[PDB]
Amino acid sequence: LPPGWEKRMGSGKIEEGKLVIWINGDKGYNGLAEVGKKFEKDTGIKVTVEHPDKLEEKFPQVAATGDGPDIIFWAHDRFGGYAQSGLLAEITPDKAFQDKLYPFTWDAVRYNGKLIAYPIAVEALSLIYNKDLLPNPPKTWEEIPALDKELKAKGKSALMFNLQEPYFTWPLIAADGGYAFKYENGKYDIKDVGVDNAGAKAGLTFLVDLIKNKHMNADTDYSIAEAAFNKGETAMTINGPWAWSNIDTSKVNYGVTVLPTFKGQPSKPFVGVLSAGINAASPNKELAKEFLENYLLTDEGLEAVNKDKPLGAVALKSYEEELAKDPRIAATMENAQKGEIMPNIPQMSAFWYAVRTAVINAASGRQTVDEALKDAQ
Ligand SMILES: OC[C@H]1O[C@H](O[C@H]2[C@H](O)[C@@H](O)[C@@H](O)O[C@@H]2CO)[C@H](O)[C@@H](O)[C@@H]1O
């Protein structure tokens, strides 16, 4: 199980009197660092924002040995698993603080009756399109192939998104009836990975058909997708609010809109709530609580992070109402509403690993759409 246990053995594990915060590379870590500086000026407490690669997997490795950051940022879906491993301190906001956030966001970070993290923003994938190449985006997945060959004559592609992470292809898979775990009447039934049904099958086959007919390459990743769109080579892409910042600086005239339908049914992106949890091994819990409640989760705090990279629909009511006017955010919520909030059950990491492989192989010439979808059942 453990990696890197030997190195840190005698090094003072999590430093006292300091704050170490981890957050994914695609998020506004400089904006967060600004809140840190505001925190440093008021308290003398030094804040250090880092963005390690493979964050979602590096944290459970180091935290299991009493290591890592005081504060861990990630979508809520992996927090129940962190909680079951005893990596998270329980958080104690009072009622007056909880009322400042949307109740549905606290539910996303509630595991076994306990609040295990602070909600920050609601994330959902949307269709992002180049208006100069495509003033009106297609409403259906089915009209993409015809659109793509049309654009091919001009040396442009129709659609390019990250095919390595199942997060980006999940809304296709779930549009017709695919699902992770049955949620019947309050609690999830793990004994039916609904990733096997016809609805799921029909979704991935189309993606596989899109690569069979050369409309998409199966080796396309986040960096390749972002580059093709931001330079102006592809007309559409699929991404979250965090990506808007790099697109903004590329001067592609872009719009953010509802994901394409499939079989007359909307794509259902897996909705993620960006959350901040406190390491169980942190000797700075009160400092972390003070930082999170009175510095980050304020209008000034969220604005700083947002200006760097858009968080989407923030969990804090007061700062939200100022953002709702942004149609890109409206589009995010529209897609979120058509999708479903990810569960936080510990099985999710297992789910994600399976589907990921189940998607890569089926999209490639290594396994079929069943030697991958049964391989993940
Ligand atoms: O691809 C599986 C992956 O999906 C989600 O990860 C998202 C994350 O929520 C977003 O904030 C953004 O960083 O894109 C990620 C996909 O690369 C799940 O949250 C994650 O647990 C899961 O592994």
mmCIF file of C-alpha atoms and ligand atoms in Angstrom:
data_model
loop_
_atom_site.group_PDB
_atom_site.id
_atom_site.type_symbol
_atom_site.label_atom_id
_atom_site.label_comp_id
_atom_site.label_asym_id
_atom_site.label_seq_id
_atom_site.Cartn_x
_atom_site.Cartn_y
_atom_site.Cartn_z
ATOM 1 C CA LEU A 1 0.000 0.000 0.000
ATOM 2 C CA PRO A 2 2.342 2.811 1.117
ATOM 3 C CA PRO A 3 4.677 4.979 -1.012
ATOM 4 C CA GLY A 4 7.209 7.565 0.186
ATOM 5 C CA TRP A 5 6.862 6.505 3.824
ATOM 6 C CA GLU A 6 10.596 6.218 4.458
ATOM 7 C CA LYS A 7 11.616 9.741 3.393
ATOM 8 C CA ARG A 8 9.383 11.775 5.699
ATOM 9 C CA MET A 9 9.909 9.500 8.731
ATOM 10 C CA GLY A 10 11.819 11.988 10.900
ATOM 11 C CA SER A 11 10.791 15.187 9.169
ATOM 12 C CA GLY A 12 8.244 17.061 11.291
ATOM 13 C CA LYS A 13 5.153 15.738 9.500
ATOM 14 C CA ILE A 14 2.630 18.560 9.123
ATOM 15 C CA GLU A 15 4.258 21.777 10.285
ATOM 16 C CA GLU A 16 2.852 23.747 13.196
ATOM 17 C CA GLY A 17 1.808 27.378 12.774
ATOM 18 C CA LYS A 18 1.701 27.157 8.970
ATOM 19 C CA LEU A 19 -1.000 26.354 6.404
ATOM 20 C CA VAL A 20 -0.357 23.994 3.502
ATOM 21 C CA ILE A 21 -3.186 23.802 0.978
ATOM 22 C CA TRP A 22 -3.430 21.411 -1.966
ATOM 23 C CA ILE A 23 -5.631 22.119 -4.978
ATOM 24 C CA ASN A 24 -5.777 20.706 -8.505
ATOM 25 C CA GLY A 25 -3.633 22.236 -11.242
ATOM 26 C CA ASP A 26 -6.648 23.291 -13.301
ATOM 27 C CA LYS A 27 -8.034 25.441 -10.473
ATOM 28 C CA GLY A 28 -7.311 29.038 -9.476
ATOM 29 C CA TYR A 29 -4.392 28.380 -7.131
ATOM 30 C CA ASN A 30 -2.914 31.885 -7.510
ATOM 31 C CA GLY A 31 -6.213 33.453 -6.546
ATOM 32 C CA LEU A 32 -6.274 31.109 -3.570
ATOM 33 C CA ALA A 33 -2.721 32.172 -2.727
ATOM 34 C CA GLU A 34 -4.003 35.758 -2.660
ATOM 35 C CA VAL A 35 -6.464 34.801 0.066
ATOM 36 C CA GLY A 36 -3.497 33.173 1.766
ATOM 37 C CA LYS A 37 -1.572 36.452 1.645
ATOM 38 C CA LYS A 38 -4.609 38.273 3.061
ATOM 39 C CA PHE A 39 -4.593 35.616 5.766
ATOM 40 C CA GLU A 40 -0.853 36.044 6.346
ATOM 41 C CA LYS A 41 -1.183 39.816 6.758
ATOM 42 C CA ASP A 42 -3.950 39.515 9.354
ATOM 43 C CA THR A 43 -2.622 36.645 11.462
ATOM 44 C CA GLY A 44 1.068 36.157 10.735
ATOM 45 C CA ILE A 45 0.173 32.636 9.639
ATOM 46 C CA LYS A 46 1.960 31.665 6.431
ATOM 47 C CA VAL A 47 -0.106 29.939 3.749
ATOM 48 C CA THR A 48 1.422 27.802 1.000
ATOM 49 C CA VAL A 49 -0.648 26.781 -2.012
ATOM 50 C CA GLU A 50 0.636 23.791 -3.960
ATOM 51 C CA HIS A 51 -0.795 21.957 -6.955
ATOM 52 C CA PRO A 52 0.677 18.428 -7.101
ATOM 53 C CA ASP A 53 0.038 16.187 -10.100
ATOM 54 C CA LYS A 54 -2.232 13.185 -9.498
ATOM 55 C CA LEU A 55 -3.618 15.099 -6.519
ATOM 56 C CA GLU A 56 -6.623 12.824 -5.989
ATOM 57 C CA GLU A 57 -4.270 9.895 -5.491
ATOM 58 C CA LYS A 58 -1.314 11.597 -3.839
ATOM 59 C CA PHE A 59 -3.408 12.823 -0.903
ATOM 60 C CA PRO A 60 -4.819 9.445 0.177
ATOM 61 C CA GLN A 61 -1.269 8.046 0.057
ATOM 62 C CA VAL A 62 0.384 10.692 2.213
ATOM 63 C CA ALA A 63 -2.572 11.415 4.532
ATOM 64 C CA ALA A 64 -2.679 7.709 5.421
ATOM 65 C CA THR A 65 0.713 8.224 7.056
ATOM 66 C CA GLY A 66 -0.305 11.363 8.927
ATOM 67 C CA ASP A 67 1.116 13.550 6.171
ATOM 68 C CA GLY A 68 0.150 16.021 3.520
ATOM 69 C CA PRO A 69 -1.586 19.413 3.437
ATOM 70 C CA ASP A 70 -3.678 20.926 6.197
ATOM 71 C CA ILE A 71 -6.356 21.447 3.566
ATOM 72 C CA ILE A 72 -7.265 19.313 0.553
ATOM 73 C CA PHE A 73 -9.312 20.582 -2.398
ATOM 74 C CA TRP A 74 -11.191 18.236 -4.716
ATOM 75 C CA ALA A 75 -14.660 17.411 -5.990
ATOM 76 C CA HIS A 76 -16.863 15.969 -3.257
ATOM 77 C CA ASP A 77 -17.045 12.505 -4.822
ATOM 78 C CA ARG A 78 -13.802 11.284 -3.213
ATOM 79 C CA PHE A 79 -14.382 12.646 0.288
ATOM 80 C CA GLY A 80 -16.490 9.797 1.660
ATOM 81 C CA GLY A 81 -13.609 7.501 0.758
ATOM 82 C CA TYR A 82 -11.156 9.810 2.497
ATOM 83 C CA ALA A 83 -13.482 9.846 5.508
ATOM 84 C CA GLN A 84 -13.750 6.054 5.708
ATOM 85 C CA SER A 85 -9.941 5.946 5.712
ATOM 86 C CA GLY A 86 -9.874 8.433 8.587
ATOM 87 C CA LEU A 87 -8.019 11.086 6.591
ATOM 88 C CA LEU A 88 -10.478 13.890 7.324
ATOM 89 C CA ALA A 89 -11.134 15.948 10.420
ATOM 90 C CA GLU A 90 -14.821 16.547 11.022
ATOM 91 C CA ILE A 91 -15.815 20.177 10.517
ATOM 92 C CA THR A 92 -17.904 22.193 12.958
ATOM 93 C CA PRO A 93 -19.491 25.234 11.324
ATOM 94 C CA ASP A 94 -22.314 26.804 13.321
ATOM 95 C CA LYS A 95 -25.844 27.158 11.978
ATOM 96 C CA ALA A 96 -25.303 30.822 11.097
ATOM 97 C CA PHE A 97 -22.398 29.852 8.864
ATOM 98 C CA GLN A 98 -24.187 26.898 7.254
ATOM 99 C CA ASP A 99 -27.059 29.194 6.292
ATOM 100 C CA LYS A 100 -24.645 31.210 4.146
ATOM 101 C CA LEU A 101 -24.302 28.267 1.761
ATOM 102 C CA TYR A 102 -26.906 26.446 -0.329
ATOM 103 C CA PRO A 103 -28.240 23.452 1.666
ATOM 104 C CA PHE A 104 -27.803 21.141 -1.340
ATOM 105 C CA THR A 105 -24.054 21.851 -1.274
ATOM 106 C CA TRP A 106 -23.697 20.772 2.371
ATOM 107 C CA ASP A 107 -25.452 17.509 1.492
ATOM 108 C CA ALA A 108 -22.735 16.759 -1.066
ATOM 109 C CA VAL A 109 -20.175 16.891 1.758
ATOM 110 C CA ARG A 110 -22.289 15.012 4.281
ATOM 111 C CA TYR A 111 -21.045 11.455 4.840
ATOM 112 C CA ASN A 112 -22.531 9.169 7.508
ATOM 113 C CA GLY A 113 -24.391 12.061 9.120
ATOM 114 C CA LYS A 114 -21.210 14.110 9.431
ATOM 115 C CA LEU A 115 -20.067 17.159 7.497
ATOM 116 C CA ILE A 116 -16.623 16.182 6.222
ATOM 117 C CA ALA A 117 -15.732 19.192 4.064
ATOM 118 C CA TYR A 118 -16.621 22.762 3.131
ATOM 119 C CA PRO A 119 -18.468 23.194 -0.189
ATOM 120 C CA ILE A 120 -17.078 25.925 -2.459
ATOM 121 C CA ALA A 121 -18.518 25.635 -5.965
ATOM 122 C CA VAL A 122 -20.836 23.539 -8.122
ATOM 123 C CA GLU A 123 -19.138 22.202 -11.258
ATOM 124 C CA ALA A 124 -20.662 20.767 -14.417
ATOM 125 C CA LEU A 125 -19.336 20.196 -17.921
ATOM 126 C CA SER A 126 -20.754 22.233 -20.783
ATOM 127 C CA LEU A 127 -20.429 22.412 -24.552
ATOM 128 C CA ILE A 128 -17.960 25.157 -25.478
ATOM 129 C CA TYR A 129 -18.137 26.320 -29.097
ATOM 130 C CA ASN A 130 -16.300 28.672 -31.471
ATOM 131 C CA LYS A 131 -18.793 31.261 -32.709
ATOM 132 C CA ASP A 132 -16.785 32.285 -35.774
ATOM 133 C CA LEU A 133 -16.595 28.725 -37.057
ATOM 134 C CA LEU A 134 -19.989 27.792 -35.665
ATOM 135 C CA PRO A 135 -22.408 30.653 -34.778
ATOM 136 C CA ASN A 136 -25.055 28.128 -33.775
ATOM 137 C CA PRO A 137 -23.947 24.896 -32.063
ATOM 138 C CA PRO A 138 -25.582 21.508 -32.769
ATOM 139 C CA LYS A 139 -28.324 20.383 -30.372
ATOM 140 C CA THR A 140 -27.753 16.660 -30.898
ATOM 141 C CA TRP A 141 -24.731 14.350 -30.797
ATOM 142 C CA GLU A 142 -26.133 12.657 -33.897
ATOM 143 C CA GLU A 143 -25.561 15.657 -36.167
ATOM 144 C CA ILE A 144 -21.889 15.906 -35.183
ATOM 145 C CA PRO A 145 -20.519 13.461 -37.816
ATOM 146 C CA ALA A 146 -22.228 15.351 -40.642
ATOM 147 C CA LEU A 147 -20.925 18.585 -39.125
ATOM 148 C CA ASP A 148 -17.407 17.204 -38.791
ATOM 149 C CA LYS A 149 -16.956 16.110 -42.398
ATOM 150 C CA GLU A 150 -18.386 19.493 -43.379
ATOM 151 C CA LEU A 151 -15.649 21.224 -41.366
ATOM 152 C CA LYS A 152 -12.954 18.842 -42.574
ATOM 153 C CA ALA A 153 -12.819 20.503 -46.006
ATOM 154 C CA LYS A 154 -11.663 23.707 -44.305
ATOM 155 C CA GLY A 155 -8.910 22.086 -42.255
ATOM 156 C CA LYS A 156 -10.857 22.190 -38.999
ATOM 157 C CA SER A 157 -12.432 19.606 -36.690
ATOM 158 C CA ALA A 158 -15.923 19.643 -35.149
ATOM 159 C CA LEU A 159 -15.315 18.357 -31.627
ATOM 160 C CA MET A 160 -12.317 17.650 -29.427
ATOM 161 C CA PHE A 161 -12.473 16.826 -25.722
ATOM 162 C CA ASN A 162 -10.421 14.830 -23.197
ATOM 163 C CA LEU A 163 -10.970 11.112 -23.810
ATOM 164 C CA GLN A 164 -8.533 9.939 -21.134
ATOM 165 C CA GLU A 165 -10.690 10.848 -18.123
ATOM 166 C CA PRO A 166 -14.165 9.220 -17.994
ATOM 167 C CA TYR A 167 -15.534 12.451 -16.485
ATOM 168 C CA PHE A 168 -15.665 14.023 -19.945
ATOM 169 C CA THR A 169 -17.374 11.097 -21.699
ATOM 170 C CA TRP A 170 -19.752 10.184 -18.868
ATOM 171 C CA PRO A 171 -22.539 12.556 -19.975
ATOM 172 C CA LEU A 172 -22.726 10.666 -23.284
ATOM 173 C CA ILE A 173 -22.830 7.270 -21.552
ATOM 174 C CA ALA A 174 -25.555 8.282 -19.089
ATOM 175 C CA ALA A 175 -27.852 10.144 -21.493
ATOM 176 C CA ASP A 176 -29.779 7.059 -22.586
ATOM 177 C CA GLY A 177 -29.905 5.306 -19.208
ATOM 178 C CA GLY A 178 -26.404 4.609 -17.902
ATOM 179 C CA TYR A 179 -25.677 5.078 -14.198
ATOM 180 C CA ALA A 180 -23.068 4.464 -11.496
ATOM 181 C CA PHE A 181 -25.006 3.002 -8.574
ATOM 182 C CA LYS A 182 -28.770 2.686 -8.195
ATOM 183 C CA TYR A 183 -30.086 5.383 -5.886
ATOM 184 C CA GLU A 184 -33.401 3.938 -4.767
ATOM 185 C CA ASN A 185 -35.078 5.685 -1.843
ATOM 186 C CA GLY A 186 -32.291 7.330 0.152
ATOM 187 C CA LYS A 187 -29.255 5.064 -0.147
ATOM 188 C CA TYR A 188 -27.155 3.704 -3.013
ATOM 189 C CA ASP A 189 -27.310 0.055 -4.022
ATOM 190 C CA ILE A 190 -23.753 -0.898 -4.960
ATOM 191 C CA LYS A 191 -24.831 -4.323 -6.275
ATOM 192 C CA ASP A 192 -25.920 -2.789 -9.580
ATOM 193 C CA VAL A 193 -23.239 -0.960 -11.518
ATOM 194 C CA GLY A 194 -25.738 0.398 -14.044
ATOM 195 C CA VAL A 195 -22.805 1.013 -16.371
ATOM 196 C CA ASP A 196 -23.759 -2.222 -18.138
ATOM 197 C CA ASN A 197 -27.227 -1.476 -19.517
ATOM 198 C CA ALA A 198 -28.412 -0.602 -23.025
ATOM 199 C CA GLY A 199 -28.436 3.133 -22.334
ATOM 200 C CA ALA A 200 -24.786 3.034 -21.320
ATOM 201 C CA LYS A 201 -24.016 0.730 -24.250
ATOM 202 C CA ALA A 202 -25.653 3.065 -26.765
ATOM 203 C CA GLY A 203 -23.710 6.027 -25.408
ATOM 204 C CA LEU A 204 -20.209 4.596 -25.653
ATOM 205 C CA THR A 205 -20.838 2.881 -28.988
ATOM 206 C CA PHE A 206 -21.542 6.294 -30.520
ATOM 207 C CA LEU A 207 -18.251 7.632 -29.141
ATOM 208 C CA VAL A 208 -16.595 4.509 -30.507
ATOM 209 C CA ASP A 209 -18.451 5.085 -33.772
ATOM 210 C CA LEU A 210 -17.204 8.681 -33.784
ATOM 211 C CA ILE A 211 -13.656 7.359 -33.655
ATOM 212 C CA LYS A 212 -14.463 4.495 -36.077
ATOM 213 C CA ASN A 213 -15.463 7.124 -38.628
ATOM 214 C CA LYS A 214 -12.354 9.218 -37.788
ATOM 215 C CA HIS A 215 -14.233 12.156 -36.282
ATOM 216 C CA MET A 216 -12.246 11.890 -33.051
ATOM 217 C CA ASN A 217 -8.840 10.458 -32.139
ATOM 218 C CA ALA A 218 -8.773 8.156 -29.111
ATOM 219 C CA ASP A 219 -5.451 9.506 -27.847
ATOM 220 C CA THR A 220 -6.827 13.028 -27.397
ATOM 221 C CA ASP A 221 -6.253 14.324 -23.866
ATOM 222 C CA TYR A 222 -6.965 17.505 -21.866
ATOM 223 C CA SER A 223 -3.932 19.375 -23.187
ATOM 224 C CA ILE A 224 -4.520 18.336 -26.802
ATOM 225 C CA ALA A 225 -8.219 19.238 -26.612
ATOM 226 C CA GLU A 226 -7.595 22.610 -24.968
ATOM 227 C CA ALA A 227 -4.901 23.464 -27.507
ATOM 228 C CA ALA A 228 -6.985 22.626 -30.575
ATOM 229 C CA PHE A 229 -9.891 24.771 -29.396
ATOM 230 C CA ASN A 230 -7.904 27.715 -28.018
ATOM 231 C CA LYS A 231 -5.809 28.091 -31.168
ATOM 232 C CA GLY A 232 -8.892 27.776 -33.356
ATOM 233 C CA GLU A 233 -8.474 24.350 -34.932
ATOM 234 C CA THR A 234 -11.596 22.682 -33.550
ATOM 235 C CA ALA A 235 -15.054 24.267 -33.363
ATOM 236 C CA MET A 236 -16.264 22.619 -30.154
ATOM 237 C CA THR A 237 -14.925 21.147 -26.934
ATOM 238 C CA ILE A 238 -16.278 19.920 -23.600
ATOM 239 C CA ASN A 239 -15.030 21.392 -20.343
ATOM 240 C CA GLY A 240 -15.838 23.064 -17.043
ATOM 241 C CA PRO A 241 -15.730 26.675 -15.788
ATOM 242 C CA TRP A 242 -12.035 26.441 -14.859
ATOM 243 C CA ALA A 243 -11.131 26.253 -18.556
ATOM 244 C CA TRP A 244 -12.792 29.574 -19.452
ATOM 245 C CA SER A 245 -9.745 31.543 -18.327
ATOM 246 C CA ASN A 246 -7.320 30.144 -20.895
ATOM 247 C CA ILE A 247 -9.973 30.405 -23.595
ATOM 248 C CA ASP A 248 -10.558 34.035 -22.642
ATOM 249 C CA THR A 249 -6.893 34.864 -23.211
ATOM 250 C CA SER A 250 -6.854 33.116 -26.589
ATOM 251 C CA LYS A 251 -9.415 35.415 -28.251
ATOM 252 C CA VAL A 252 -11.511 32.632 -29.640
ATOM 253 C CA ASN A 253 -14.989 34.114 -29.727
ATOM 254 C CA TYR A 254 -16.687 31.386 -27.732
ATOM 255 C CA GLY A 255 -20.023 30.549 -26.145
ATOM 256 C CA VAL A 256 -20.938 28.115 -23.382
ATOM 257 C CA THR A 257 -24.120 26.110 -23.801
ATOM 258 C CA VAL A 258 -26.176 23.001 -23.083
ATOM 259 C CA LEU A 259 -24.517 19.687 -23.972
ATOM 260 C CA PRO A 260 -25.787 17.925 -27.129
ATOM 261 C CA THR A 261 -28.726 15.540 -26.721
ATOM 262 C CA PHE A 262 -28.580 11.828 -27.506
ATOM 263 C CA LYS A 263 -31.522 9.675 -28.592
ATOM 264 C CA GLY A 264 -33.555 12.819 -27.950
ATOM 265 C CA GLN A 265 -32.222 12.780 -24.387
ATOM 266 C CA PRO A 266 -29.890 15.302 -22.711
ATOM 267 C CA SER A 267 -26.326 14.449 -21.804
ATOM 268 C CA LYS A 268 -26.163 13.989 -18.043
ATOM 269 C CA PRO A 269 -22.792 15.247 -16.773
ATOM 270 C CA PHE A 270 -21.712 14.047 -13.340
ATOM 271 C CA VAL A 271 -22.049 17.114 -11.132
ATOM 272 C CA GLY A 272 -19.140 17.809 -8.806
ATOM 273 C CA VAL A 273 -19.013 20.081 -5.782
ATOM 274 C CA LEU A 274 -15.528 21.504 -5.261
ATOM 275 C CA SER A 275 -14.852 21.009 -1.563
ATOM 276 C CA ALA A 276 -12.194 21.777 1.043
ATOM 277 C CA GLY A 277 -11.478 19.204 3.729
ATOM 278 C CA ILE A 278 -9.138 19.330 6.695
ATOM 279 C CA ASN A 279 -6.529 16.617 7.170
ATOM 280 C CA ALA A 280 -7.123 14.514 10.289
ATOM 281 C CA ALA A 281 -3.397 14.822 11.009
ATOM 282 C CA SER A 282 -3.337 18.617 10.850
ATOM 283 C CA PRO A 283 -2.269 20.414 14.056
ATOM 284 C CA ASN A 284 -3.744 23.595 12.576
ATOM 285 C CA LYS A 285 -7.421 22.728 12.387
ATOM 286 C CA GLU A 286 -8.568 25.976 14.000
ATOM 287 C CA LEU A 287 -6.340 28.004 11.683
ATOM 288 C CA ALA A 288 -7.745 26.043 8.745
ATOM 289 C CA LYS A 289 -11.309 26.601 9.938
ATOM 290 C CA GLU A 290 -10.619 30.313 10.340
ATOM 291 C CA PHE A 291 -9.125 30.465 6.861
ATOM 292 C CA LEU A 292 -11.969 28.568 5.218
ATOM 293 C CA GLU A 293 -14.913 30.227 6.977
ATOM 294 C CA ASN A 294 -13.726 33.824 7.352
ATOM 295 C CA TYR A 295 -11.361 34.292 4.403
ATOM 296 C CA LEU A 296 -12.093 31.938 1.503
ATOM 297 C CA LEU A 297 -15.851 31.490 1.861
ATOM 298 C CA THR A 298 -16.553 35.220 1.640
ATOM 299 C CA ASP A 299 -17.288 37.474 -1.338
ATOM 300 C CA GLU A 300 -13.738 38.830 -1.354
ATOM 301 C CA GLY A 301 -12.319 35.343 -0.948
ATOM 302 C CA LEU A 302 -14.300 33.698 -3.723
ATOM 303 C CA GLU A 303 -13.754 36.684 -6.025
ATOM 304 C CA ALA A 304 -9.978 36.292 -5.785
ATOM 305 C CA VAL A 305 -10.061 32.623 -6.789
ATOM 306 C CA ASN A 306 -12.756 33.288 -9.395
ATOM 307 C CA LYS A 307 -10.799 36.077 -11.133
ATOM 308 C CA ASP A 308 -7.917 33.645 -11.564
ATOM 309 C CA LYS A 309 -10.031 30.692 -12.696
ATOM 310 C CA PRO A 310 -13.866 30.557 -12.720
ATOM 311 C CA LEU A 311 -15.265 28.223 -10.074
ATOM 312 C CA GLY A 312 -18.678 27.978 -11.697
ATOM 313 C CA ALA A 313 -21.687 28.312 -9.398
ATOM 314 C CA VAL A 314 -20.306 29.129 -5.950
ATOM 315 C CA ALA A 315 -21.828 27.586 -2.831
ATOM 316 C CA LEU A 316 -21.990 30.945 -1.028
ATOM 317 C CA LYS A 317 -25.340 32.646 -1.679
ATOM 318 C CA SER A 318 -24.114 36.252 -1.492
ATOM 319 C CA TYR A 319 -21.386 35.886 -4.129
ATOM 320 C CA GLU A 320 -23.578 33.682 -6.302
ATOM 321 C CA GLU A 321 -26.270 36.248 -7.105
ATOM 322 C CA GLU A 322 -23.604 38.481 -8.647
ATOM 323 C CA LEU A 323 -22.476 35.675 -10.960
ATOM 324 C CA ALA A 324 -25.856 34.370 -12.138
ATOM 325 C CA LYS A 325 -25.922 37.166 -14.728
ATOM 326 C CA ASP A 326 -23.054 35.359 -16.487
ATOM 327 C CA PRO A 327 -24.714 33.167 -19.167
ATOM 328 C CA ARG A 328 -21.742 30.778 -19.087
ATOM 329 C CA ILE A 329 -22.658 30.097 -15.470
ATOM 330 C CA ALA A 330 -26.313 29.773 -16.445
ATOM 331 C CA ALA A 331 -25.282 27.176 -19.030
ATOM 332 C CA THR A 332 -23.277 25.339 -16.366
ATOM 333 C CA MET A 333 -26.321 25.159 -14.098
ATOM 334 C CA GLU A 334 -28.515 24.044 -16.995
ATOM 335 C CA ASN A 335 -26.189 21.131 -17.708
ATOM 336 C CA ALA A 336 -25.841 20.387 -13.985
ATOM 337 C CA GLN A 337 -29.620 20.287 -13.644
ATOM 338 C CA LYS A 338 -29.813 17.724 -16.460
ATOM 339 C CA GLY A 339 -27.092 15.621 -14.861
ATOM 340 C CA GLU A 340 -26.862 14.287 -11.331
ATOM 341 C CA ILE A 341 -24.739 15.044 -8.274
ATOM 342 C CA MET A 342 -21.979 12.478 -7.811
ATOM 343 C CA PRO A 343 -22.359 10.242 -4.769
ATOM 344 C CA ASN A 344 -19.585 10.429 -2.180
ATOM 345 C CA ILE A 345 -19.611 6.736 -1.279
ATOM 346 C CA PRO A 346 -16.105 5.202 -0.846
ATOM 347 C CA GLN A 347 -16.656 3.031 -3.931
ATOM 348 C CA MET A 348 -16.384 6.023 -6.274
ATOM 349 C CA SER A 349 -12.608 5.810 -6.709
ATOM 350 C CA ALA A 350 -13.065 2.183 -7.753
ATOM 351 C CA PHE A 351 -15.913 3.173 -10.059
ATOM 352 C CA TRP A 352 -13.796 5.874 -11.710
ATOM 353 C CA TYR A 353 -10.839 3.552 -12.276
ATOM 354 C CA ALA A 354 -13.010 0.890 -13.901
ATOM 355 C CA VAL A 355 -15.003 3.193 -16.190
ATOM 356 C CA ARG A 356 -11.793 5.017 -17.135
ATOM 357 C CA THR A 357 -10.229 1.783 -18.390
ATOM 358 C CA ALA A 358 -13.633 0.700 -19.710
ATOM 359 C CA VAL A 359 -13.631 3.867 -21.837
ATOM 360 C CA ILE A 360 -10.004 3.932 -23.022
ATOM 361 C CA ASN A 361 -10.015 0.339 -24.249
ATOM 362 C CA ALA A 362 -13.424 0.425 -25.929
ATOM 363 C CA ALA A 363 -12.382 3.630 -27.684
ATOM 364 C CA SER A 364 -9.160 1.922 -28.729
ATOM 365 C CA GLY A 365 -8.291 -1.313 -30.495
ATOM 366 C CA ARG A 366 -7.386 -3.112 -27.280
ATOM 367 C CA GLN A 367 -10.805 -4.191 -26.043
ATOM 368 C CA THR A 368 -14.362 -3.943 -27.367
ATOM 369 C CA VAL A 369 -17.306 -1.980 -25.965
ATOM 370 C CA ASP A 370 -18.057 -5.094 -23.856
ATOM 371 C CA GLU A 371 -14.581 -6.490 -23.016
ATOM 372 C CA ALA A 372 -14.303 -3.121 -21.281
ATOM 373 C CA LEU A 373 -17.887 -2.585 -20.021
ATOM 374 C CA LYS A 374 -18.146 -6.118 -18.650
ATOM 375 C CA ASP A 375 -14.550 -5.812 -17.510
ATOM 376 C CA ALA A 376 -15.809 -2.959 -15.329
ATOM 377 C CA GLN A 377 -18.992 -4.696 -14.160
HETATM 378 O O1 LIG B 1 -12.317 11.335 -14.749
HETATM 379 C C1 LIG B 1 -12.722 10.843 -13.490
HETATM 380 C C2 LIG B 1 -12.657 11.958 -12.451
HETATM 381 O O2 LIG B 1 -13.794 12.787 -12.595
HETATM 382 C C3 LIG B 1 -13.840 13.867 -11.686
HETATM 383 O O3 LIG B 1 -12.667 14.650 -11.779
HETATM 384 C C4 LIG B 1 -12.801 15.932 -12.356
HETATM 385 C C5 LIG B 1 -12.928 17.007 -11.282
HETATM 386 O O4 LIG B 1 -14.126 16.825 -10.559
HETATM 387 C C6 LIG B 1 -12.958 18.388 -11.928
HETATM 388 O O5 LIG B 1 -12.889 19.380 -10.925
HETATM 389 C C7 LIG B 1 -11.826 18.573 -12.942
HETATM 390 O O6 LIG B 1 -10.581 18.683 -12.287
HETATM 391 O O7 LIG B 1 -11.791 17.497 -13.858
HETATM 392 C C8 LIG B 1 -11.606 16.234 -13.253
HETATM 393 C C9 LIG B 1 -11.464 15.176 -14.342
HETATM 394 O O8 LIG B 1 -10.152 15.197 -14.857
HETATM 395 C C10 LIG B 1 -13.942 13.316 -10.276
HETATM 396 O O9 LIG B 1 -14.047 14.384 -9.362
HETATM 397 C C11 LIG B 1 -12.699 12.485 -9.999
HETATM 398 O O10 LIG B 1 -12.760 11.941 -8.699
HETATM 399 C C12 LIG B 1 -12.594 11.377 -11.041
HETATM 400 O O11 LIG B 1 -11.378 10.682 -10.884
#
